[PDB]
Curated annotation (Swiss-Prot):
Impact noted for substituting G808R: Found in an endometrial carcinoma sample; uncertain significance
Function according to Swiss-Prot or TrEMBL: Phosphoinositide-3-kinase (PI3K) phosphorylates phosphatidylinositol (PI) and its phosphorylated derivatives at position 3 of the inositol ring to produce 3-phosphoinositides. Uses ATP and PtdIns(4,5)P2 (phosphatidylinositol 4,5-bisphosphate) to generate phosphatidylinositol 3,4,5-trisphosphate (PIP3). PIP3 plays a key role by recruiting PH domain-containing proteins to the membrane, including AKT1 and PDPK1, activating signaling cascades involved in cell growth, survival, proliferation, motility and morphology. Participates in cellular signaling in response to various growth factors.
EC number(s) reported in the record: 2.7.1.137, 2.7.1.153, 2.7.11.1
MF annotations from Gene Ontology: 1-phosphatidylinositol-3-kinase activity; 1-phosphatidylinositol-4,5-bisphosphate 3-kinase activity; 1-phosphatidylinositol-4-phosphate 3-kinase activity; ATP binding; insulin receptor substrate binding; protein kinase activator activity; protein serine kinase activity; protein serine/threonine kinase activity
GO annotation (BP), single: regulation of cellular respiration
Organism: Homo sapiens
A Pfam match: PI3K_rbd
Protein name as catalogued: Phosphatidylinositol 4,5-bisphosphate 3-kinase catalytic subunit alpha isoform
Phylogenetic classification of the source organism: Eukaryota, Metazoa, Chordata, Craniata, Vertebrata
Domain remark from Swiss-Prot or TrEMBL: The PI3K-ABD domain and the PI3K-RBD domain interact with the PI3K/PI4K kinase domain. The C2 PI3K-type domain may facilitate the recruitment to the plasma membrane. The inhibitory interactions with PIK3R1 are mediated by the PI3K-ABD domain and the C2 PI3K-type domain with the iSH2 (inter-SH2) region of PIK3R1, and the C2 PI3K-type domain, the PI3K helical domain, and the PI3K/PI4K kinase domain with the nSH2 (N-terminal SH2) region of PIK3R1.
Length: 847
């Protein structure tokens, strides 16, 4: 049909590749994913039309609210008698005159009540037919949340800024919601446990090799047996035809058992050449058998062993690569993995205060710590009691002998009834260590029960990353994330961008491609907007490309203006939403304000006019830095962890104002960076006005009177935070231009080159002089840094988990758990609270 064709062209433009290539993929699991994945879209759409227009508006404009409505102590103290002042605006008449009505109401009031008292104040000079909007952006207070719980409101309370809201008619916004229609695509309409034996695979011959074959059977990151090398053979004729046998009985193969193979070379000095992984069981629970042609992959940078089991699974798309032919045993009938029922029949067929405390002490340990064999057998012999302390489940999982059908089954049964655990702990079971399907299933259930959309968005990038660790295209995690993204555009955005940014990586081109297809096919009119965005970025990447090649600094600016002035460019880079925050409208380019940043890598400084009716109450211009050339993933993770830390200190009662500015990777070493209005570098303050005593003076001039004190406070608190943080994360070398301060005293860092590889933030005499060595102010400062350090050491588990999940991404500074152990060093996990305290005190003495 017509709608089908158009939708296909647009989806092709958004994903980057045309849909018609997915069709030509003669692969059962691919087609069955593209089809079977559709009832998730159905569920989401049904949820969208369930309450009709209100449900739609909620789908497009979800409430940006904190996780818990409760407010910390100091935050509540910011309120005058537990109340808040709020300015509600109204546009009226043909001239759209703006009239303001100020109010003082309880911070726990519902937006409906705010509208009530607002109309009351408007008449003293009509029921709930109105909704509240944020003056200057596209945020709406559509749900009956307490106003203070909205991120915008709580922020306004902490910063001391007064909220400016706009009263809008419900029908004026509903009239803006398009009538979407999800059209179904045109592409929608045995022995088991008996096999007794040992695993043996035959390698036949290799092609495209102009050395031996090392192989192994692994369960995630652990080999279910010993690796076996095939007979060394001359490189000219790649013909082994050999039969390798493994010390693993066929029934004893876990559900997620994988074959990991590679081709090593011989000078003595061994070096891999091409790697590949195969699922012993397919997506229909069948067991591999017969011949199979597997196209291998080149080796990633920084490889330790002659095997890459953590690498993606499947046959290389580029068939013009080393292709290995394998031969699996074929038995009487098509063998399947037993049903959970038979697992229960074989499962059923197959204690002192001292150790009662020992188990607790074990569960208290962090994930990085290793578990000894005696401790593994210990936890296993105590597998039933470990159910009362559910947070020990990960370590318990690590104690199972996954090469024994018995233990595997009994563990399955222990999972079918295991108590749910908190999300932060549930994600721990979603990294590469836990590849089992029922384990990841349990974790996904936990996330479905206790994960707030706030926390989901906060932990989105990691989840999208652990997608790569899934054994099959169609799984529970992908369906959960996809439904959440098809019911919450605030999540669907960074879902689509986290996915698209890696469409250049052929390791996951297929997966993320199909997923992105199913998403774009059911996301609604927003697809259009995304396309516009994808075009804008497109154009940008072109220009920067021509800037870093043909005209690779004043001439660069001239050329840039001329290319930018072309109408194609003007249209394609005007009137679209900010990929950093889709609530931000970006209208006409203010070219007179755009420029090349003249620092390194030719950063592009872009300035747009804010088209919002009330753009003046937020910012009349939105400035962003398009950078093409520098990998932004590391910066994304760093800023994320900074926001999380800030939320921890706030939820703990110490106001250390951090600044986790935006930062979104949208492709291969391309991305956007949020501009912090009114900020300058240390070196810039030192310049205007070798010298190290004019920072305090500059701040004093920029903050005269009763403001002075306030300013100081900020610069202190923030500073302390950015100190502690930078010490724990081991951020790269800081200097006078890596650091920045705002005209109000806010201090924050930028450009986190490399982390986890030592006191980087050696507070210079500037900062110290700004805080007051022997002064009560410095004492309060030290107390702050100590408190913060403790607060973070109390979530070392969370952070370590986050990194362990981010391993899947090919970031250089994060290639193995060895890189993560650094945090285990700086946090003093193996020591006690006091021991770690002395550790941080002494570490901070080393000026
Ligand atoms: C715009 C400001 C204020 O808002 C916060 C962001 N800021 C900022 N970020 C960066 C940056 C950080 N991280 C990266 N991975 C890459 C970059 C890239 F832009 F180079 N660089 C700069 N430079 C501009 C002034 O001259 C020298 C420094 N400024």
């Amino acid at each position: 049909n017509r709608e089908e064709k158009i939708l296909n062209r647009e989806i092709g433009f958004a994903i980057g590749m045309p849909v018609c290539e997915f069709d030509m993929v003669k692969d059962p699991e691919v087609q069955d994913f593209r089809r079977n994945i559709l009832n998730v879209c159905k569920e989401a759409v049904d949820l969208r039309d369930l309450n009709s227009p209100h449900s739609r508006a909620m789908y497009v404009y979800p409430p940006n609210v904190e996780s818990s409505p409760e407010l910390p102590k100091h935050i509540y103290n910011k309120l005058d008698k537990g109340q808040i002042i709020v300015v509600i605006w109204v546009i009226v008449s043909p001239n759209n005159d703006k009239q303001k009505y100020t109010l003082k109401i309880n911070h726990d009031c519902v937006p409906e009540q705010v509208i009530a008292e607002a109309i009351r104040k408007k008449t003293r000079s009509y029921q709930g037919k109105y909704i509240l909007k944020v003056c200057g952006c596209d945020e709406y207070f559509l749900e009956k949340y307490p106003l203070s719980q909205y991120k915008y409101i709580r922020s306004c309370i902490m910063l001391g800024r007064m909220p400016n809201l706009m009263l809008m008619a419900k029908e004026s916004l509903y009239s803006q919601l398009p009538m979407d229609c999800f059209t179904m695509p045109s592409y929608s309409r045995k022995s088991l446990w008996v096999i007794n034996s040992a695993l043996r695979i035959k390698i036949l011959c290799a092609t495209y090799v102009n050395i031996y074959v090392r192989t192994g059977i692994y369960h995630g990151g652990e080999p279910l047996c010993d690796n076996v090398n095939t007979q060394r053979v001359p490189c000219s004729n790649p013909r082994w035809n050999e039969w390798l046998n493994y010390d693993i009985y066929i029934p004893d193969l876990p559900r997620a058992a994988r074959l990991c193979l590679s081709i090593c070379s011989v000078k003595e000095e061994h070096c891999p050449l091409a790697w590949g992984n195969i699922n012993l069981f397919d997506y229909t629970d069948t067991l591999v058998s017969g011949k199979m042609a597997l196209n291998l992959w080149p080796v990633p940078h920084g490889l330790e062993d002659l095997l890459n089991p953590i690498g993606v699974t499947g046959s290389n798309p580029n068939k013009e690569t080393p292709c290995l032919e394998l031969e699996f045993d074929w038995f009487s009938s098509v063998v399947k993995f037993p049903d959970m029922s038979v697992i229960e029949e074989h499962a059923n067929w197959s204690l002192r205060e001292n150790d009662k405390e020992q188990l607790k002490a074990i569960s208290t340990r962090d994930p990085l710590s290793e578990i000894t064999e005696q401790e593994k057998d210990f936890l296993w012999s105590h597998r039933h009691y470990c159910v009362t302390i559910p947070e020990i489940l990960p370590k318990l999982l690590l104690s199972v002998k996954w090469n024994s059908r018995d233990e595997v089954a009994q563990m399955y049964c222990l999972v079918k009834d295991w108590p749910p655990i908190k999300p932060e702990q549930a994600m721990e079971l979603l990294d590469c260590n836990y590849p089992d399907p029922m384990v990841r299933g349990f974790a996904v259930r936990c996330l479905e029960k206790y994960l707030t959309d706030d926390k989901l968005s906060q932990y989105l990038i990691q989840l999208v990353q652990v997608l790569k660790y899934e054994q099959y295209l169609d799984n529970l995690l992908v369906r959960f994330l996809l439904k959440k993204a098809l019911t919450n555009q605030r999540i669907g955005h960074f879902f689509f961008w986290h996915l698209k940014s890696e469409m250049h990586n052929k390791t996951v081109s297929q997966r993320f491609g199909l997923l992105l297809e199913s998403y774009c096919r059911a996301c609604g009119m927003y697809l259009k907007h995304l396309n516009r965005q994808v075009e804008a970025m497109e154009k940008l990447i072109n220009l920067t490309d021509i800037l870093k090649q043909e005209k690779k600094q004043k001439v660069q600016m001239k050329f840039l203006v001329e290319q930018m002035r072309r109408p194609d460019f003007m249209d394609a880079l005007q009137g679209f939403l900010s990929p950093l925050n889709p609530a931000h409208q970006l209208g006409n380019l203010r070219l007179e304000e755009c420029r090349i940043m003249s620092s390194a890598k030719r950063p592009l400084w872009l300035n747009w006019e804010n088209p919002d009716i009330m753009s003046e109450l937020l910012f009349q211009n939105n400035e962003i830095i398009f950078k093409n050339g520098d990998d932004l993933r590391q910066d994304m993770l760093t800023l994320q962890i900074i926001r999380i830390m800030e939320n921890i200190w706030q939820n703990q009662g110490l106001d250390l104002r951090m600044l986790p500015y935006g930062c979104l990777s949208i492709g291969d070493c391309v991305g956007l960076i949020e501009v912090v209005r009114n900020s300058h570098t240390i070196m810039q303050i030192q310049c205007k006005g070798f010298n190290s005593h004019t920072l305090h003076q500059w701040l004093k001039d920029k903050n005269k009177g009763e403001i002075y004190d306030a300013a100081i406070d900020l610069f202190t608190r923030s500073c302390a935070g950015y100190c502690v943080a930078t010490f724990i994360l081991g951020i790269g070398d800081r200097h006078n231009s890596n650091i920045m301060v705002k005209d109000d005293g806010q201090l924050f860092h930028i450009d986190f080159g490399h982390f986890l590889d030592r006191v980087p933030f050696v507070l210079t005499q500037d900062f110290l002089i700004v805080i007051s060595t022997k002064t009560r102010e410095f004492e309060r400062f030290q107390e702050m840094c100590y408190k913060a350090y403790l607060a973070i050491r109390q979530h070392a588990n969370l952070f370590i988990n986050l990194f362990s999940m981010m391993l899947g991404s090919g970031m250089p500074e994060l290639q193995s758990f060895d890189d993560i152990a650094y945090i285990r060093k700086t946090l003093a996990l193996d020591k006690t609270e006091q021991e770690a305290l002395e550790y941080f005190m002494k570490q901070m003495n080393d000026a």
